[PDB]
Structure 1
Amino acid sequence: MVNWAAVVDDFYQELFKAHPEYQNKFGFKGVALGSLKGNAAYKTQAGKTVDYINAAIGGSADAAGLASRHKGRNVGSAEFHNAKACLAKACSAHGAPDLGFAIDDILSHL
């Protein structure tokens, strides 16, 4: 199966490399990027992001709900447009399908 866990790991590396300040909103704030896999808060978050991708692909994803929850953290359209770029890089690096369509679904509610 597509190794979405590996894609998500690469996604967060790209996201926080380009926008380190985004990391301050998570429970793993301040942790060196190269050590995230050893951080408990990160393990949980990465698992949820993987779950969301599989839900988007599987058809059960609540894009409206995820958008609203991100708005609830002052994360909106600009951040998700930036995320689209990082996730595209991460997917391509693993020979996985691009997930732009899934991000666009979220963006449609932002």
Structure 2
Amino acid sequence: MVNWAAVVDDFYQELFKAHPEYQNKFGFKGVALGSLKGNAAYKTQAGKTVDYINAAIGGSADAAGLASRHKGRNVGSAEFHNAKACLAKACSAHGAPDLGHAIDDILSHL
């Protein structure tokens, strides 16, 4: 089985390194990147992201509902363009399958 938990950990490392102001919208605001793996708010967020990935691949993901929830946090197209790039880098690092089609489905509702 693909280790998506390892992929997701690398994705958040990439996203907040390049766009640290995005981290301000989360319950782990202000926590050093090298301390995220022991942080409770981060472990919850990471688990929900792994879940969405396994739902997208297994065929049950609700992209419209995820997009609507991101609009409700004032998170939109520009942020997801950035995320697509960061997640491609994380997948490559681990020899895991590309997830670009899943991200495009979210963008179609933004």
TM class, shorter-length: over 0.9
**TM-score, normalised relative to structure 2:** 0.99
**Structure 2 residues without counterparts, runs of 5 or longer:** none
Q: Which residue of 1 aligns with 2:93?
A: 93
Residue 46 of structure 1 deviates from its aligned partner by: 0.1
Runs of 4+, deviation exceeding 6 Å: none
Could you list the per-position Cα deviations for residues 19-63 of structure 1 after superposition, in whole angstroms to 9, with x for gaps in the alignment?
Answer: 000000000000000110010000000000000000000000000
Determine what percentage of the aligned residue pairs are the same residue: 99
Provide the C-alpha distance between the structure 2 equivalents of 1:3 and 1:22, rounded to a whole number of angstroms: 25
Residue 75 of structure 1 deviates from its aligned partner by: 0.5
Task: Give the length in aligned residue pairs.
Answer: 110
Provide the C-alpha distance between the structure 2 equivalents of 1:26 and 1:99, rounded to a whole number of angstroms: 23
Could you list the per-position Cα deviations for residues 51-103 of structure 1 after superposition, in whole angstroms to 9, with x for gaps in the alignment?
Answer: 00000000000000000000110110000000000000000101011100000
Root mean square deviation of aligned Cα = 0.4
